[model samples]
Target: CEEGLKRLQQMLAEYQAQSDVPQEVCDQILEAAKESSVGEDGVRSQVKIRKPNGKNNIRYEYDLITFYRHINYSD
Candidate 1:
């Protein structure tokens, strides 16, 4: 699942870096995932992105509290 998540992250980076995830879309995604969660045992969590067709287009559940929080911002 890490590989898949990495690929998804790449796509997210490209989309965000190229055009920026639109505020409206971000709000919608956040709102959808705000209700439910994925993962378990403190390993991960869920974030779902619902599309116009009424189907879940993408899921963004991740472990932000652990592996995600470390940011090497210093250059």
Candidate 2:
């Protein structure tokens, strides 16, 4: 599922970077990605990490769309 999501996002970016991509086609791809990321009722994907100051761990919960938007896979 994660790989599928990444591939869709990369395709979206490629479309956006090109000059000749039709607006309607880009819209369709964006909508498809948004729809595929979560259920109709919505879902939360979370990450946990330890604090740098020796404090308790911090937890962040994000929807699938937001989660992937912040990730950088090109490296």
Candidate 3:
């Protein structure tokens, strides 16, 4: 649980730097992480990221029950 914070940050950086993923999108996904990890949603949450320009989109679900981050992104 403790290590996940740093790991998530690293992944977020990678996504931003390499994939050109925006912070809004990252924040959306991270919000789901918070909800599932710390918030009331102890089960799971489905996260879909859509660009404002409508070019990129995403479909991903994280298993907070197991603390696993499984994200599927499309651009």
Candidate 4:
């Protein structure tokens, strides 16, 4: 059987945790990074989504995946 998207999300969370970053921090960090990027190509899906409500006036958005990786400023 094919694994569901939620399962995949969970697996990625686990993988990210093993890479020396806590899952909760990773989720929050990614949430902040997504704001800078919008309308770019190949941004299929975000690893996490932030939702402030469950009713009709709900607000939610996703962060890009690049936030999980370390930044390099090599010369």
Which one is best on lDDT? 4
TM-score: model 2 vs. ground truth = 0.22
Comparing 2 and 4 on lDDT, the stronger one: 4
The C-alpha local distance difference test score for the whole of candidate 1 amounts to 0.51
TM-score of 4: 0.26
TM-score of each: 0.22, 0.22, 0.22, 0.26
Q: Which stretches of candidate 3 lie over 4 Å from their true place?
A: 1-19, 35-75
Give the Å shift of residue 57 in candidate 1: 29
Model 1 quality (TM-score): 0.22
- Residues 1-75, model 2: lDDT tens digits: 133344676676565454456556767765677534544343453533322112432565354664666455755
| Candidate 3 residue-wise lDDT at 54 | 30
Candidate 3, overall lDDT? 0.52
lDDT of 4 by residue, 1-75 (tens): 545456677776576344467556767876787656444465665734424212232455375654675567534
Candidate 2: where is the Cα deviation over 4 Å?
1-16, 35-75
Residues 1-75, candidate 1, lDDT per residue (tens digit)?
A: 133344686676566443367556766876688336432454443554323223333566565654566566735
Best by TM-score: 4
Pick out the ten consecutive residues of candidate 4 with the lowest summed lDDT. 48-57
